[PDB]
Design a protein around this ligand. Structure first.
Ligand code: NX7
Ligand code: ZN
Ligand code: ZN
Ligand code: ZN
Length: 572
């Protein structure tokens, strides 16, 4: 009931009852809120309400203190003070940006912009508020009751009338009823049970809204610069493999936190694991939002670090198949590999947070909450894809607003930049270097002469809102008969519905751009499918074409992105 003010930390009794988080506001700040917003309910030990029987006045602006009790204009005794006076709300121990965060629906980009340009305590308020709002939106969607079970990977669904139907991608993970988590793909719908169960007809699925805990720790701890490497002990015997990263590794030990911008295939995993070999006695917690990113760091560790000193931390509510080659759930091992949501309460000499473009400010805070560390390293690329903002439908979120780390990387620049792409044919490196990396990304590989582009708008059909371009899949089919080396190629598009069609016609393994991020394939076929802001997003485009080691075919809808591709153009 008595806590600290989210804007000035000033001790107070006052909480906003109208805010969904109910933040402590100090007399001077609580006023500026309630006088400028539809937010009028204030809480103390007891609510600021008229205490007269049957009186429904709760608006703090229309209330008075009569003794130790509160009354409206109609019930106040002659000797009474207005609760709102001289820029204050009467409480014990006697902001434009707070108001916008407190009252926005989170459907506008500008909401996310403000949640990242504001002060540090307002980043936490925003991050809880947003996440709270995201969770209570899941309740808006209708229940899926099973009408008929066709097979072990297909069934038919009956949807709740009067409630919208959630996108049936892999993004939207349902909870079945507790028959385990389930996902769906597009009357024949494809079902995938994290726990395998003889699917019972009549059983139902619901999206698991998880309670949003409060944030305490900042997104980013305060920066500390040191004169010598602090708390870490370097080798003099670091293998030439990692000699390229020694100067950056010393920067890591002479700062509290450091930022690494690593474009695709520039040696991020190599950097992260090489840090353990440079500071060989240091305890390092390796974290990322997704299981795939933490498992990617496990593969690299398996190759270079002693397997006995590694532990993969798996939450007992296991949702996807996870890295198996380490001892599982040994929190005390020198090397700990854990998703942000599973992190234990522990300490560490270095924390490495990977895939930083995918992190929210909520995730940045949780990490700082669960891990007390001498050094924090943030690895990723603001030119790659951010975490999906399910509520955002109006305006595009720029990379400087993805989170606090990406905002630093886009304004004052990253502390360290890996500038040489060792994965991609020069045609792809040249294209993305000019598009998102200000001509600072360099190609280690030669031109493959296997990078082709074709301008072909085709015809755009929709499965609800997910896009399909059959003629673009048709052009790929034609190309494959003539280019049989591409039979091994991964098919990539910005839409699962296009991928679903391309899976039946082509038989290629299928991937969305967003699910492709962090993976590489010798050959990539990309159909842009549509000209929308989704399919023309330069970050998504960057990730799409930088998956390829040897060749790429890009069937394009957007003239701009087609022209920019420094690829050999095809006809038809
Ligand atoms: O100009 C740079 C840069 C660099 F070239 C070296 C170090 C830090 C930097 F921000 N970049 C633009 C986007 C990709 C990196
Ligand atoms: Zn409020
Ligand atoms: Zn205050
Ligand atoms: Zn009253």
């Amino acid at each position: 009931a008595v806590g600290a003010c989210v804007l000035c930390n000033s001790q107070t009794s006052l909480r906003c009852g109208a805010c969904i988080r109910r933040p402590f506001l100090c007399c001077k700040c609580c006023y500026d809120h309630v006088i400028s917003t539809s937010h009028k309910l204030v809480l103390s030990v007891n609510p600021y309400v008229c205490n007269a029987p049957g009186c429904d006045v709760t608006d703090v602006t229309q209330l008075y203190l009569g003794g130790m009790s509160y009354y409206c204009k109609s019930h106040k005794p002659p000797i009474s003070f207005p609760l709102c006076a001289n820029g204050q709300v009467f409480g014990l121990y006697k902001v434009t940006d707070f108001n916008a965060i407190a009252t926005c629906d989170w459907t506008n980009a500008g909401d996310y912009i403000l949640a990242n340009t504001c002060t540090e305590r307002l980043k936490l308020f925003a991050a809880e508020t947003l996440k709270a709002t995201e969770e209570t939106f899941k309740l808006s969607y209708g229940i899926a009751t099973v009408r008929e079970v066709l097979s072990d990977r297909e069934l038919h669904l009956s949807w709740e009338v009067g409630k919208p139907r959630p996108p049936l991608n892999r993004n939207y993970v349902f909870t079945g009823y507790q028959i385990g988590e389930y996902t769906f793909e597009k009357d024949a719908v494809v079902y995938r049970g994290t726990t395998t169960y003889k699917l019972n007809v009549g059983d139902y699925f619901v999206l698991t809204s998880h309670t949003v805990m409060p944030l305490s720790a900042p997104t980013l701890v305060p920066q500390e610069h040191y004169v010598r490497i602090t708390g870490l002990y370097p080798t003099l015997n670091i293998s030439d493999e990692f000699s390229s990263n020694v100067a950056n590794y010393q920067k890591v030990g002479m700062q509290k936190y450091s930022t690494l911008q690593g474009p695709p295939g520039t040696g991020k995993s190599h950097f992260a694991i090489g840090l353990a070999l440079y500071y060989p006695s240091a305890r390092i917690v390796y974290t990322a939002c997704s299981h795939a990113a933490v498992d990617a760091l496990c593969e690299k560790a398996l190759k270079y670090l002693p397997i006995d000193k590694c532990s993969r931390i798996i939450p007992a509510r296991a949702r996807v198949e996870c890295f198996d080659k380490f001892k599982v759930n040994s929190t005390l091992e020198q090397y700990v590999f854990c998703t942000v949501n599973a992190l234990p309460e522990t300490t560490a000499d270095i924390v490495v947070f990977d895939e930083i473009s995918m992190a929210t400010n909520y995730d940045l805070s949780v990490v700082n909450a669960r891990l007390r560390a001498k050094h924090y390293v943030y690895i990723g690329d603001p030119a790659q894809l951010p975490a999906p903002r399910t509520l955002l439908t109006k305006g595009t979120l720029e990379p400087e607003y993805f989170n606090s780390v990406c905002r630093l990387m886009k304004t004052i620049g990253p502390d360290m930049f890996l500038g040489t792409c060792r994965r991609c044919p020069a045609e792809i490196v040249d294209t993305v270097s000019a598009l998102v990396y200000d001509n600072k990304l360099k190609a280690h590989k030669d031109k493959s002469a296997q990078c082709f582009k074709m301008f072909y708008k085709g015809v755009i059909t929709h499965d609800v809102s997910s896009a399909i371009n059959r003629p673009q899949i048709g052009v790929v089919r034609e190309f494959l008969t003539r280019n049989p080396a591409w039979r091994k190629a991964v098919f990539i598009s910005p839409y699962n519905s296009q991928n679903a069609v391309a899976s039946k016609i082509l038989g290629l393994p299928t991937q969305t751009v967003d699910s492709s991020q962090g993976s590489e394939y010798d050959y990539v076929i990309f159909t842009q499918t549509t000209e929308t802001a989704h399919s023309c997003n330069v970050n998504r485009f960057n990730v799409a074409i930088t998956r390829a080691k040897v060749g790429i075919l890009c069937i394009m809808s957007d003239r701009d992105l087609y022209d920019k591709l420094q690829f050999t153009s095809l006809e038809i």
